[PDB]
């Protein structure tokens, strides 16, 4: 469950248990999922 920081931004609350349990189960870094669930990457061939 995401917290709206702003109308154009959101964040996962600190040490969120559902994400913690998901990262433990799936074997992924909490910080990577926490970053990638709240941000996306655009990329032209020269820049991202």
């Amino acid at each position: 469950g995401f917290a709206s920081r702003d109308s154009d931004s959101c964040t996962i609350p600190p040490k969120h248990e559902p994400l913690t349990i998901f990262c433990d189960l799936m074997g992924v870094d909490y910080e990577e999922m926490c970053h990638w669930l709240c941000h996306r990457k655009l990329a032209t061939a020269t820049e991202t």
């Binding site: 999922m33 990638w36 669930l37 996306r40 990457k41």
Partner: protein
């Protein structure tokens, strides 16, 4: 479509539903929540 087509009709008491003369019968569909069901976008970095 409302006046341009013979098979599309508007439910007399609403602006949030429409009627299609399907093969088997006229069917009234309610417009609420189609857009949210219609949208899929998976951020590739999450897959990665």
């Amino acid at each position: 479509h409302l006046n341009k087509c013979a098979l599309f009709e508007k439910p007399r008491m609403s602006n949030k539903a429409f009627i299609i003369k399907h093969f088997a019968d006229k069917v009234e569909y309610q417009c609420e929540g189609f857009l949210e069901k219609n949208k899929d976008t998976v951020f590739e970095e999450q897959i990665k």
